[PDB]
Amino acid sequence: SMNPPPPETSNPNKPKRQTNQLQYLLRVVLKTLWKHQFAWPFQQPVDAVKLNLPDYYKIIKTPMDMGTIKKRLENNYYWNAQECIQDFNTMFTNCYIYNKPGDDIVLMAEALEKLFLQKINELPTEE
Ligand SMILES: CCc1nnc2scc(-c3ccccc3)n12
Numbered sequence: 777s778m779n780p781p782p783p784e785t786s787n788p789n790k791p792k793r794q795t796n797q798l799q800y801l802l803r804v805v806l807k808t809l810w811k812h813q814f815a816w817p818f819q820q821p822v823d824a825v826k827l828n829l830p831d832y833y834k835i836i837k838t839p840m841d842m843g844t845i846k847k848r849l850e851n852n853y854y855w856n857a858q859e860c861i862q863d864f865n866t867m868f869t870n871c872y873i874y875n876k877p878g879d880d881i882v883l884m885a886e887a888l889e890k891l892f893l894q895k896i897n898e899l900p901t902e903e
Pocket of ligand 1: 829
């Protein structure tokens with residue numbers, strides 16, 4: 777069995793910014809979700825080999841996880857906040873697409889997404 781390469785976290789030719797919205801997405805949004813008791817399945821790419829999910833990457837063609845997002849934020853990968861917000865939403869959507877309602881992992885995603893939405897609701901105006 778085989779995992780795909782992980783999502784890109786480094787691309788020197790991609791133009792970058794460090795903005796107050798992106799700083800909020802690291803210091804508030806990612807940090808809030810990362811410390812949560814349900815974060816652990818989301819803190820790195822899905823290891824479909826060790827988890828015995830051989831169809832995971834047959835179904836999920838845009839993988840995303842908070843380990844990737846953390847690296848992207850810490851390494852200033854993004855131009856704008858929307859790119860990072862999209863990564864979070866991709867991560868939640870993947871979980872809901874792959875799994876069944878009420879599965880433990882879906883409940884975990886829902887708890888993280890509730891906090892994501894609460895924090896994103898107060899994304900600061902760009903300075
Ligand atoms: C985002 C994780 C995930 N998404 N779909 C499934 S079925 C099982 C898991 C899982 C549970 C614990 C640890 C690692 C993976 N997942």
